[PDB]
Every structure is written in structure tokens, then in C-alpha cells.
Design a protein around this ligand. Sequence first.
Ligand SMILES: [Zn+2]
Ligand SMILES: [Zn+2]
Ligand SMILES: [Zn+2]
Ligand SMILES: [Zn+2]
Length: 433
Amino acid sequence: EESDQLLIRPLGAGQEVGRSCIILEFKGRKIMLDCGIHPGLEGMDALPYIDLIDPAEIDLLLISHFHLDHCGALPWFLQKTSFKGRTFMTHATKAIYRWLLSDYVKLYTETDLEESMDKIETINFHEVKEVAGIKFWCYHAGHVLGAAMFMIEIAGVKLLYTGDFSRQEDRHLMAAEIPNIKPDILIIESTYGTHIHEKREEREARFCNTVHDIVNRGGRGLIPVFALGRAQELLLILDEYWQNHPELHDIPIYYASSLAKKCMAVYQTYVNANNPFVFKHISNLKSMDHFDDIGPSVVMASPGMMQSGLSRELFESWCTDKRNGVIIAGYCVEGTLAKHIMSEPEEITTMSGQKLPLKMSVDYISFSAHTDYQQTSEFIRALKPPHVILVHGEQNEMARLKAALIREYEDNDEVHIEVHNPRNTEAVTLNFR
Ligand SMILES: [Zn+2]
Ligand SMILES: [Zn+2]
Ligand SMILES: [Zn+2]
Ligand SMILES: [Zn+2]
């Protein structure tokens, strides 16, 4: 009566948000889940601790979605490394992939990015694929277009990895599915910890009212967002709000990003995963040089964290006027300017090194689309995994989620469950007969 030991260990996103990269080890098989970069770090430190292993022993690599913290390091791993296994991702994911990293570059060069394309295989949702002795398939994760939750089976043992997911339907995205096939192990995100913020209807109303308030008092409203993802949802909301308020029809809304033309084009190519994306009050803006910053307006510009680029340029030219305002709609990662601002600093530092007073208003209305405790608990209750591994949340939020889940099952339902809280590099060991 033998027993096989399964090993799970994060090289990134272990007790943190950023650079997701988790290694699975079972019966001679080695799997890597995601391969992104930490938005709050730079250089080689923004990468996961891949040095703890050698890329030549990794049979399979699965990427959940196109966000940089999940695939930002892929080109590097596929070119400048000794990796020779197979890599898979959703069709939409790969599509939106080539157009996201490029905008990010302007680690790896646009050449390294192209040399990657051919090393990445695609997979449809609900379709079994097999590599080495590994069977895998994916379910819709909600969150962003093409996002997936990968189920993996090896020797009868099943593990579901959620990547980032949302159980609440968007204005254009479907809610994550709850698989009927029960996993032995669940690796799940913990971004929001146990925090349960306003409902969608409330968040949208507050978002519109804040934007309205800013332009009404004569200010410019800045909304940092990466080219594709949540930005598309915000645009639908704004265009619709403007349509219902003609007094705003003379106030321009701009969608600014490099190649924003293909961003919408390629994005609509996958309507499968009236055309609302035919905006009547929004226009594309290529860069600061094509912008006549004349009067009040609203500008949605990347990068989402204002670490640099246009959103940062705009913020720097607008932060000293009380009439202006910025709305942060995404999860703020440590080390990020967007995160810092929300501290109410008296002044900020220009990329040049200048010091400017922060007078423009700063509002945080989250549209990052991650599950919350209620969704996560319901998710876990339906799947009933004996083992749960948390992997994409700040230390304290993750700790709170873990204690809440343990309390819910051990104390309340008086049922046995095991929740793991691995730090980067820390391994989790499980034995299957
Ligand atoms: Zn994400
Ligand atoms: Zn993420
Ligand atoms: Zn009105
Ligand atoms: Zn127990």
C-alpha cells in the first residue's frame, strides 16, 4: 500500500500579490502555474524565485490570464532560460498577450516577445489536453477576457488552480464557473482577504458621481488603467452615463494607450469569450503630444499603477490643482505610486526629481474583479476540497482569510479542512495513496 507525495511551492505570489508562479511536483512530473512579474518591484527582483529550480525540469507551464503579474515574466522564461517544456493558455489570453507586453515595454525585448509566440500552445475552455502524464482543462474564471481556472489531474489526483477569478458577472464578462468535478486540492487567490466592499450598483454610481463632480467643478479626471482588462468595463459605464446626461456632452472622454486602436479591435475579436463598444462620447488618444489639454475632461490612461508613462505624465501635470482628481479603480500593489498616493501625501516626486504639492482629489473605487469572502466561501463549500492553498494576497489579508475559513469549517460546521499559508519558497507536502 504505497503513497505518493505531492509538493506545492510558490516562487511568487506566496503571501503577496504580484509575480504569480507556483510549482507542482508529483510522480516525476513538474508543473509551473503562471509566470508574472511584481508590479511593485523592478529589474531582476520583480521576478519570482525561479533560481530555486532549473527550467529544464519543468514539463508543463499553464498561464491563467493576460495580466502582467501572471505572465509578465513569460517572454524572459521562454527565451533567456533553459526551459524546454510546453506552455499553454487561452486563445484570448495569447491574443491579448502579445498586445499587452508590447505596451509595457514602451528583462526582454520586442524580439524576445515574438520569439515566444511560437512556443505557446492554445487551449479551448472545457477541453482536455494531455502533456507528459498530465491531464488538464480549464473553466471560465471571469475577471478578464479569456481568464481561466486550470484543473489538473495526475494519477487520479486532481487540483484546481483559480488564477484570479470573480464569481460575479460583469457588464460584459461572465461569472467564474463552479466545476462539478471535485478537486483534491484547490489553489486559490486571496486578494481581498475577508474584506467585503460596496456592491456593483453602488460602485458604479459612486464612480460616475465622482467623475461628474470633478469635471463639473472645472477639473480633469484621471483614471489610470492598463490598456486592456478592467478599462473596457469602465468605458462602457462612462459612455452610458454620458449618454444619460447631455449637460456633459461637451466634455471629452479620452481612452489613452499605445495602440488603443488594436486594443479595442483585437478585444472585440473575442466577443465569444447595438455594439456597446461603439462609443459615442469616448475617443482614442495616442499620447501626450496628440493631446490639447484645454479644459475639463476625463482621461483613461495606462499604466494602471502610474509607475510611469502617460498616466504618470498626466498626474504630474494635474496634481497641483484642487479642481482635478484621480480615480484609482484597481487593486493597489505595494511599491506602486497609485498605492502611495492613497496615503494622502502633502507632496509627490516627479519622475524628473521635482517636488509638487498634491492638491487634486484622490478616490479609490475598486473594479479589479476578484472574489470576496462570500464568493470564495461558497466556492469552497461547493467543491469541498480537503486541502486549500492560498496564494495571491498580502500577508495579513491572507492570514485573515485562512483563519476565517478554518473557523467556518472547524468551529462552525465542525468539519475537517486544511488551509495552507505558504510564503514564497515554502513548500506544502501532501501524500496520496
Ligand atoms: Zn488579474
Ligand atoms: Zn493577479
Ligand atoms: Zn444629468
Ligand atoms: Zn480538522
